[PDB]
């Protein structure tokens, strides 16, 4: 929790030496347009939240 | 008060352009002067003895300063001889606060050493990059004693920040309108005569800035900070001034910074370039002592870990390794710790292998802001994972405010988030503020403005919250714990500006490469000699001196050729000293290493050839100038064969009387009037030059860049292509082992070229090249001379050599991202290769290269005028070679480039038969992968006889091998040594053991991942202290738990803690939202919550007095989130 | 008849023309011109809007 | 940074929702809580005691 | 084709068309994934990925 | 582990049969249900066979 002249700092971070995989910057407008399909009544009515809205009828 | 009764100043002029020390300056004869005089030609120095007598009516004015405004820079010395504070003449830093003992009419005296040069050299005002004017004169404007109203000063800062808030906040939100209303209420409440109106106005402004903005306590509000502000002072070593002026700038800036950090308890400072620390330590011991005291005090963080803020494109791999090694060794020996952040905010481009070297030097973090200057493609990221060629990665952060000299404006804090390009992954950012490029550090104005900014963000939370008590390490530690989600960037970070920097000042680049090669050779030879003979002392003093000089000359403004003439005169002196020391070292080693005196009438049985390359070698050596021999071998010493058979290398003239055919056993070169009209490879029976084109063609362009003459070459320069036709060829050398024709080309009046094209006799199983050497008498103005080789090889990608590997670049200008690379940096060879065949242009002194669709182009000479009016005037010796090779780019090109840059030298010997027959000291087995380059053999830095006492030393003798694969594939090798081996271990660049490797008979095996730089060591035969806390480090907590951290601290100090003395979060991962006698222990508690993700989070805390100053050890909370 | 959209709450300040004198404003939501009053959707959306302003105060 | 954080929370919600399961709905609500607040689905969100700027009336 | 998503020009190529083989090779060694009925391919930093099946509905 | 079956959620923006969008790379999920056994063991060719359950049906 603090320096004691035996430890100079906290236990060192586990930052990997090699990058495992490339990750790219997410395109803003595509991701923004994706959200509306999670609840819209379009072609995904039976695969998004609208399908889960009604338990029974 | 300014008169002669109160402020009396005498002056003394330094003899020439010399810069005497304080010891020999105050012993001279000063003559009285006064305000209004003009002082000295440019670069001269003048010492002022200033005697101050604060009058009777100023003794109790609550703030007394000495305003000194000579329009140049200066340094204030006390009577004793301690540097006190810098001064600058533009009005930026003109006040020196009187040290509270002048408040009695006793007429205390100080000294002011003024340097007759502005902050940015001595250009005829306006441009600051025009060549310096030798006859500038500076006027002493004001030299008075001023009693300043502190309330007016605070109100000035307040209203300045308020006006910036009223203008820069969005016009459609209520914050800007409220700021405008507060400004109006301040204006209407201020009356000229009265002085209480100032206090009333400050009270009015408090309703928008906060209750106590004028104190450091504003940073202890405990809210989430988003922008971390760190003070910074970038002093370019030789940009627009000589090196001596830099030696002065360093002290005159760090003294001001130390004084400020005494006044403001929250200011933190970072400065790189360990070389500047060494200068300060050598020349100004008191300033270095106070700097080191600040460093131990937890402020004034030295980071960067390099000798200088070097350029990373041109210097070879060993140069980069030496930069890191010397910088880190200096930091570890002088200060306790070793830097973990690579600081490089002003470098023109970054090599693709830099992250690997950083990870091998213990530095996992990288900071830079130069890429914001790209004028074609905006760099798309702010915080990212920069991945090297081998896959090693570092965390790179580019401050969204696009400067390292941020004026700490309100706009800068706003842009630290408005221009952040990586807000998806992280929202924190670093605001680096100060006055760089040779200037002094932050001023008090900037610190007060940051205080006001944080007050604004605390009261009306629209500004991103700024924090000032933290360090760069804290910010990067917070970044490091979420770095798995950061964007990655693979390969080089190409800088799309200053592309002419690869060519300007050709002499400096040639000297740098020669020095690198000579240093490698000498280190290998000295290692062999020191291991072989125990009486020969390894010359560590001399090697350190030469390496320090070379690394200093690799500074990001010396080597890139963008400095004034005087800087290059000093750098020429530095290189001359380096080469003289190298000559001395080589003479000593040759005395010990057998005996290699000199060259005489040759005997081809008493002479050997120095190899210094780690592979079997077989070439033609030029003994007995009429004749020649074959030097072949594997060790450092090669024997000769003295061939004589049927003649290789015929040359014959066609009836055209001007065309020549130089025919080898492997090449046939048809040379027209100066150009290679045909190049036929007799091994792969194909033509290398396309039909109708002409290789090795001198072309000239008009440079005329936009602003930065010495730095930039712009894209439009490609339009003004013009071929130089004036060749007319004739025979130059016709020996049965070497032929060569010579041509003269007239660039223009008073500028001409003489080119020699030569072909050497082929040797068994060794690709032969066409060698070209040019004597260029160059006197052009704003021209750019290049040489063209069309190579009839179709490929969309060209390979260039960089530090420790190969970079790959497009050749088609498809997008702007590729049009921006119209000129690139290649070290020793550039290769254009199709599937089964390639052509490599390999040089020895040139870095600029450009491959554009079957036409390689080597940049030869530039003639800028801005910083230097005679940049490259004179005679230049340039060498290059065309190497057509069967198969794709392979070890042949690497080995040939190394051989081209390291010609063999002959050496006689009393017994040149034992020397040759002896097995080499260190070699690679022939069955090992040819991609491995055993770049350097060097003796360990701490061997009880090499140590120099800087750092703790190991016992026995040790040898460091740096081997890297150059081609990018998994390389297997077996290293054979004849030395009696005791153990072998893998080490990093700083020579710290990593793991033991097994060895059999001095035959340990090496496995290199692609583009890896593995290194092997061969060992031959108010105070406060922490007590405990409740929750330990690394304890596991619920995802959104509410807990409390309780430290207990003991005093262990003479003084006593004031009443408040709380802990106030100067750290990283925010987790907020829920007196003591020298003997006993006090517990402190903070309330924290765990963040919204499974991770490890680390928060740094610190005891602070209830007035701002922080003290004691550093505390942290370490938790893991389970989820 | 504000639909209690996020945009409506944002425009209640972005389109305020008298921010110099006062910053408070009234958001009148429902379904007017002969329609019924507010629906449960609008009330829940206003709850979410205040939650947003409390957690990330923009 | 507010819009980017909202986008990130939306992405984390989308990736945490599966059609068949019904506990994924509770998990998604818990994820959204990190941007909307602990208990947005209750009137207590209006009792935080902070300065209100827009008054909503049905 | 690139395998690193450095710029948008490379992030746009997250899935490419290969006819009969896709090869990832260093200097002296490579691995080729060669198919007989599939065209979609994606190499992203040491991980070749062959697109097998999609189930659209529109 | 090479030759690893992974599944993503497609759900493109508008053109279902045409588009697969970049964000689909985020929903990676490995199919683990293998359990290997011998299928052919001739002295010139060997081969093991595994069954992996993508989901019900
Ligand atoms: Zn600089």
UniProtKB/TrEMBL annotation, chain E:
Top-rank lineage group of the source organism: Eukaryota
Function: Degrades free oligosaccharides in the vacuole.
Family: Belongs to the glycosyl hydrolase 38 family.
The protein's name in its UniProt record: Alpha-mannosidase
Segment of the intact protein contained: 867 to 924 of 1079
